[PDB]
Structure formats: C-alpha cells, structure tokens
Design a protein around this motif. Structure first.
Motif, mmCIF file in Angstrom:
data_model
loop_
_atom_site.group_PDB
_atom_site.id
_atom_site.type_symbol
_atom_site.label_atom_id
_atom_site.label_comp_id
_atom_site.label_asym_id
_atom_site.label_seq_id
_atom_site.Cartn_x
_atom_site.Cartn_y
_atom_site.Cartn_z
ATOM 1 N N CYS C 133 -1.965 37.685 -21.818
ATOM 2 C CA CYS C 133 -1.169 38.905 -21.942
ATOM 3 C C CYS C 133 -0.436 39.286 -20.658
ATOM 4 O O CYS C 133 -0.572 40.406 -20.165
ATOM 5 N N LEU C 134 0.342 38.350 -20.125
ATOM 6 C CA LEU C 134 1.168 38.619 -18.954
ATOM 7 C C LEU C 134 2.634 38.283 -19.226
ATOM 8 O O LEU C 134 3.023 37.117 -19.258
ATOM 9 N N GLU C 135 3.434 39.327 -19.423
ATOM 10 C CA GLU C 135 4.850 39.199 -19.752
ATOM 11 C C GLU C 135 5.646 38.778 -18.523
ATOM 12 O O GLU C 135 5.140 38.854 -17.404
ATOM 13 N N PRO C 136 6.895 38.326 -18.725
ATOM 14 C CA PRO C 136 7.765 38.017 -17.585
ATOM 15 C C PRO C 136 7.833 39.200 -16.632
ATOM 16 O O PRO C 136 7.699 39.030 -15.420
ATOM 17 N N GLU C 137 8.041 40.389 -17.187
ATOM 18 C CA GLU C 137 8.101 41.606 -16.390
ATOM 19 C C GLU C 137 6.869 41.717 -15.502
ATOM 20 O O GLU C 137 6.971 42.051 -14.323
ATOM 21 N N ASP C 138 5.707 41.425 -16.076
ATOM 22 C CA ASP C 138 4.454 41.453 -15.333
ATOM 23 C C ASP C 138 4.490 40.486 -14.153
ATOM 24 O O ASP C 138 4.221 40.872 -13.015
ATOM 25 N N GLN C 169 11.306 34.484 -17.862
ATOM 26 C CA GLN C 169 12.150 35.519 -18.440
ATOM 27 C C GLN C 169 13.389 34.927 -19.102
ATOM 28 O O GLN C 169 13.968 35.532 -19.999
ATOM 29 N N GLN C 170 13.784 33.736 -18.667
ATOM 30 C CA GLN C 170 14.941 33.063 -19.243
ATOM 31 C C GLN C 170 14.588 32.327 -20.533
ATOM 32 O O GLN C 170 15.438 32.147 -21.405
ATOM 33 N N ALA C 176 14.274 34.697 -27.942
ATOM 34 C CA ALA C 176 14.196 36.062 -28.443
ATOM 35 C C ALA C 176 14.582 36.154 -29.912
ATOM 36 O O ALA C 176 15.723 35.875 -30.284
ATOM 37 N N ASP C 177 13.610 36.523 -30.741
ATOM 38 C CA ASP C 177 13.853 36.902 -32.131
ATOM 39 C C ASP C 177 14.115 35.740 -33.087
ATOM 40 O O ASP C 177 13.944 35.880 -34.299
ATOM 41 N N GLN C 178 14.529 34.596 -32.553
ATOM 42 C CA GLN C 178 14.908 33.470 -33.405
ATOM 43 C C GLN C 178 13.993 32.242 -33.308
ATOM 44 O O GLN C 178 14.205 31.251 -34.006
ATOM 45 N N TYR C 179 12.970 32.309 -32.460
ATOM 46 C CA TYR C 179 12.040 31.188 -32.316
ATOM 47 C C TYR C 179 10.608 31.614 -32.047
ATOM 48 O O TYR C 179 10.359 32.643 -31.421
ATOM 49 N N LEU C 180 9.668 30.800 -32.517
ATOM 50 C CA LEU C 180 8.254 31.143 -32.444
ATOM 51 C C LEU C 180 7.442 30.180 -31.572
ATOM 52 O O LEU C 180 7.484 28.957 -31.745
ATOM 53 N N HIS C 181 6.703 30.756 -30.631
ATOM 54 C CA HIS C 181 5.898 29.987 -29.694
ATOM 55 C C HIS C 181 4.515 29.724 -30.282
ATOM 56 O O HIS C 181 3.990 30.537 -31.044
#
Lengths: 36, 49, 358, 143
Positions: C133-138, C169-170, C176-181
């Motif tokens: 649970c560590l986002e790019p922002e994090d 972040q890139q 974003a929104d169109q692909y699933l990890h």
C-alpha cells in the motif's frame, strides 16, 4: 542363496494402487490443480 | 550472524559488491558468470572477427 | 466475531478447522457461504480433505479460496473483471518504454537504465509497492524526506526512490483506468467486499498463513467487518498482543501477525474468542519428532534420551546418490512398511538443484 | 446489460453482441415464471463431488479411490413441489428444434446427472426434474 527368495519377489512386485497414480485428483466441468 | 557474516573467497565477496553497487559501473544486474570455457570460446570468436 | 485459534506445529489446528466446516456442511447444506481462505498452494489440498467424508463426500456451502480466487469471485459479481489483464512481462515492456523517455531525469540509475535486467528489478519493486500500500505519491513523499539531510546512503537512497517514483507515477498514468495490474485485484477486492452481500453472514476460516502483506491485510480486516464470523489459525506459542516478538524468537512471524490482527479486531470492537491447542496431535505416536518440535528453539535444550527410529540424518556422495538413495528408501517404505506414495514428501530449499535429476 | 457494462462485467463488444429478446424470452416460458415465483433461489453455485475413480474412467478397473469432480450449477430454485435445476445453453439450434432436442439431450445428458448427483449426495436432498434453456429460438427441454 541366502536372499534367493527375497530377490525373486521384489523383482516380481507391483504397486497395488498403481493404476490410480496417473489419474488427476481434481477434474473440472464447464485453477492449475485440476483437469478437464 | 554467522550466516549473514562475510566469510568467503575474495571472488565471493566481489560478487556481493557487484550485486550491491552494480549501478555505479556499467553492469547488468542479474549478470551471469561464465565459466572459463565458454568465456574463452567467446574470446576465440571476437578474435576471429 | 473474531476467533483466534493458535498453537504450535502439529497441534491439530487445520484438522480442527476441516472437521468444523464438515459438520457445518452436515448440519445446513444450503446455509450461508463458508469461505476457507488458505495460501495458493494449500487450496487443492483442503479441497480434497473437506470432500473426504463417508456422509457427504463433497461440499457446496463451503469453498476453498486463495486471495486471488476469492477476489476473482467477488469481482465476477461486484465488477471489474472485463478489464484487460497485464502480465509481468507486459509491465516490463511498458517499463522499458518509460525508462527510455524519462531516462535523463534519473539522479542515480541513469547508467543502469540501459541494462535489460534493470526492467525486471524495477517491475519487482513496484509490485512490492502495491502489495504494501505505497502509492507513487507516497514514494515521492519519502524520496524528499531523505533529500537535504546528510547521511550518505540516505541521499543516495532518496535518489533511487526519486527515480523509481518517476517510472512508478508514469506507469500509473499509462495504466490509468484502462489496464489491470496483477497485484491490483487485492485492492479491488478490499473495496468491493462491502457491497458484496453473499459474503455477509458468511463464516470464514484462514489457515496456512505465516504473514500477511498490507494489501492482503486490507482484505482481512474488511472481512472482519462485513463477515459474520472469522477465525484466524496461527502457528505460534502463546503469543502476546501488547508486544511484538523479539528478533530471535521462533514465532516472530506468526506472533507478529497475531498481534496486529488482534489489535485491529480490538479497535474494530469485535467479539473475540481464544483457543489454545496444547497437546500434540500429529506426533502422539512418534516421540522423537514430538521432541524435535518441542525443543527446537530453547538453547537450554534437553537431549533426547530414547531409541532412534523415526528420525535419521544421512550423508550422500552427491545429489545423485542422495536422490537415488532416497528413491530406494521410498520403495522400502511402500513395499515393506506398507505406506503409499501419497504419504511421502520431499522438500528442497533450492529445488532447482535437484529438479532435473529428480 | 448496461449496468454490467458500467461495472465492467461486460466488454464493449460483449454488450453489443447480446440479443435482449432471447434473454427476456426465458422469463415468459413456464420454467421462467416458476423461477421467478419461488421460496428460495441461488445462481452460479460452485460444487466439488467426490466419486470413485471408476465412475468416470471405466478403463482402469482396480482402484476405487475418490477423485473430485468440480463444476458450477447455473441455477437452483425451490418451490412447494421440490428442488429444481436450471441451465442455460448457447448451443446453435435453428439453421426444427424437434429434431435437435434428442441430440442436445445427449450432449448435456452426462453433465446434468453429475449436477443432481452433487446436490443429492452432498445436500442430502433430491432434485426433481431439470430444465435446460436455449437462447436460439428460446426453447426448453426437461430431463
């Protein structure tokens, strides 16, 4: 010889449950642990 | 700590160093160590070229 | 309601859970869903055991799930499955495209960006960032915490985090929104659990886990909330919920997880119950193995004073002789001692060494 | 259909590919009306059924260790009569259906018995009758 009897049976032995050793446990009907 | 300790051949140490600081030089992490055989066979090739 | 079932290895936890789910199938075949949550490799094992009964010989109310299959299920209902899925290689392919353009912005890895093995190393680090649970922002946040403080190694660190932060972040912006990890399902599950209702009033059992990733954690505590009953099976010895285990105690892992869980269940004001399993279940007929398990940790270890039969150490001239010697042992076990191949298991810390030969 | 699409249980194509009529038709059939009006109902029902190895593989005849047959029952519903089974099949029929019925019956003949078997053995209740629906023409047949 001393072991003349044992050697005879072990070479003529068989796995009692053998015929189930190649059969897939899980079988799906429509997970990598099952088959079709 | 005996398992985490540094006790080995100098090569074994060098490996640990390369793995850690690989990014300082030009070295691909996950690099492979070729045995003295294939290495020489590559020498023969580049030589002929 | 949360139930903590704990004890040492071979105390009979798993059996105790199997039997329960079975009686529960015996009592109300069409009752509310019973979710058995185990590690991925333990799934097919429990499926075979549950269904092993003279009475029923199968199950409908109960299901065996890993965090994955559980997510997949809840999602085929709550939604998100028609979203395209990306393979680890697909991520690396993307990454290599990103490393190219954003290359010149790297403060450290600019020289390492080229190498093809650097894409796999980043891909693995980003995976770890989601699971925890560590986002790019994090990552961005941390990257500038070590910036402008002088401990060389900190500075260097903050630089790596900075570079990772970019590619990170890139990637998020390109996915974003169109692909699933791959690691996106667990976060997706955790936030879809609340409105998935067939898991409400559901009994769930977790077993076979030593630890839980923050992401997996985010799923459990969200189950603790919306599920009627949940039981946690943990292999440990009378763990404490006020202190995390010391570095050098055997049950550091499981003990740690218990502490966290119990605290999460405490703050979440749940009705808690305890079951401590003391006696040996697995080793009642085997004294030696029962001793090995009991005296494994203590340095003031008492030597076993009895005869040698069950436990034996053996040395081979080489891995061939080893496997080849074990091969005949297994034959001696099946033919003489009347075992079945299914009763034997061989483990290797580095299976890659024996795999081919085996 | 649109809600699914929004929630992403349906791809843009899958959406456009659906024939609404063939879906609504079922609920105008008798079985449909029955499904609607019922005490209890559930769909997408997962099951695992332990069977003697022979029951499936005749070939090998000696070992009777149980193997797991796993599947999903499309639909189960309960009325004041008993428990009924329901399965929807996208098989192609019209290209009458009178002649297709026998063939279709034998195609899913084995499958459906395993379904009821799973229910009857595991749940310890019994399944009276089983219906299959076909989107092509919107037909129904009972077993």
């Amino acid at each position: 010889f001393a072991f003349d009897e044992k050697a005879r049976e072990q070479l003529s032995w068989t796995y009692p449950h053998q015929e189930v050793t190649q059969i897939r446990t899980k079988q799906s009907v429509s997970d990598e642990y099952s088959g079709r | 700590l005996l398992n985490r300790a540094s006790i080995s051949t100098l090569h074994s140490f060098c490996l640990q160093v390369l793995k850690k600081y690989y990014y300082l030089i030009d070295l691909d992490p996950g690099f492979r160590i070729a045995d003295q055989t294939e290495g020489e066979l590559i020498g023969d090739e580049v030589l002929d070229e | 309601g949360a139930e903590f079932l704990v004890g040492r290895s071979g105390s009979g936890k798993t059996k105790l859970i199997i039997n329960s789910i079975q009686d529960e199938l015996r009592r109300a075949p069409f009752g509310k869903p019973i979710i058995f949550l185990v590690p991925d490799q333990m799934t097919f094992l429990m499926e075979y055991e549950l269904a092993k009964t003279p009475d029923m010989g199968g199950m409908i109310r109960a299901q065996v799930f890993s965090f994955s299959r559980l997510a997949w299920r809840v999602l085929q209902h709550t939604g998100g499955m028609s979203r395209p899925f990306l393979t680890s290689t697909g991520v690396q392919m993307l990454l290599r495209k990103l490393i190219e353009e954003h290359k010149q912005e790297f403060k450290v890895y600019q020289k390492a960006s080229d190498k093809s093995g650097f894409t796999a190393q980043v891909e693995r680090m980003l995976t770890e960032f989601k699971r925890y649970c560590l986002e790019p922002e994090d990552i961005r946040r941390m990257a500038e915490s070590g910036t402008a403080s002088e401990y060389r190694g900190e500075r260097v660190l903050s630089e790596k985090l900075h570079d990772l932060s970019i590619l990170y972040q890139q990637m998020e912006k390109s996915l974003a929104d169109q692909y699933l990890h791959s690691e996106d399902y667990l976060t997706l599950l955790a936030e879809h659990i609340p409105l998935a209702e067939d898991i409400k009033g559901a009994h769930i059992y977790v077993d076979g886990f030593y630890q839980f990733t923050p992401q997996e954690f985010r799923v459990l505590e969200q189950l603790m909330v919306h599920a009627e009953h949940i039981t946690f099976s943990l292999t440990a010895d009378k763990p404490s919920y006020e202190r995390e285990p010391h570095e050098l105690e055997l049950f550091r892992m499981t003990g740690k997880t218990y502490y966290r869980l119990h605290q999460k269940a405490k703050e979440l004001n749940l009705d808690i119950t305890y079951k401590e399993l003391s006696g040996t279940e697995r080793h009642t007929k085997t004294p030696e193995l029962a001793h090995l398990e009991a005296q494994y940790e203590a340095r003031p270890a008492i030597p076993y004073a009895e005869k040698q039969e069950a436990l034996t150490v053996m040395q081979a001239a080489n891995r061939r002789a080893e496997l080849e010697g074990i091969a005949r042992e297994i034959h001696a076990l099946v033919r003489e001692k009347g075992y079945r191949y299914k009763d034997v298991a061989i483990l290797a810390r580095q299976p890659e060494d024996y795999k081919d030969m085996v | 259909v649109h809600r699914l699409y929004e929630k992403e249980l349906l791809t843009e194509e899958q959406k456009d590919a659906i024939d609404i009529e063939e879906i609504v038709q079922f609920f105008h059939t008798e079985i449909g009306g029955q499904l609607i009006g019922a005490k209890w109902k559930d769909r997408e029902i997962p099951f695992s059924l332990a069977l003697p190895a022979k029951e499936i593989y005749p070939d090998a005849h000696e070992a009777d260790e149980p193997l797991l047959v796993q599947g999903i029952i499309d639909c189960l519903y309960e009325t004041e009569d008993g428990l009924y089974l329901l399965a929807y099949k996208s098989d192609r029929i019209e290209g009458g259906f009178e002649g297709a019925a026998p063939i279709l019956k034998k195609r899913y003949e084995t499958q459906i018995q395993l379904y009821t078997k799973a229910v009857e053995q595991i749940a310890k209740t019994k399944v009276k009758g089983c219906a299959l629906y076909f989107f092509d023409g919107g037909h129904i047949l009972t077993l």
